[PDB]
Amino acid sequence: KMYDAYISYVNNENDRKFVNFILKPHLENKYSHKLLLNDTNILPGAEPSAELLMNISRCQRLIVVLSQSYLEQEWCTTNFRQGLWHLIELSRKPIFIIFQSQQKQISQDISQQLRQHQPSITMITWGAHSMTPSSGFWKELALVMPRK
Secondary structure: EEOOOOEOOOHHHHHHHHHHHHHHHHHHOOOOOEEEEEOOOOOOOHOOOOOHHHHHHHHHEEEEEEEOOOHHHHHHHHHHHHHHEEEHHHOOOOOEEHHHHHOOOOOOOHHHHHHHHHHEEEEEOOOOOHHOOOHHHHHHHHOOOOOO
């Protein structure tokens, strides 16, 4: 049992529907990946949860749907850098989906930590132009997932 990615998101109706109606079926039906996913907190107290540790140990990638709603979780607001260090240590290059429409809403701290850690992470931006099958979003995400 080896999955291609664990997808971490938050219990937001927009985020839930984007994951379940767009991201997950595209990965599963086109690129035919095996995915685990959950809207649990992966870093209670900015330390890996037991569930994260299990899932990392059985998944080849970590995808985080890093919306403004996601970034309202406790570890994001008080120690995003430590959380990011844990994800880098556990998943080598964690993948962060970020929404271009929210880039102004993202705190300066978060944005600076993301840029700071660019060599250790993969940041893929989802914009208005990204849904179309030919978009750069789907190209980069196929490129960073396990090849089939």
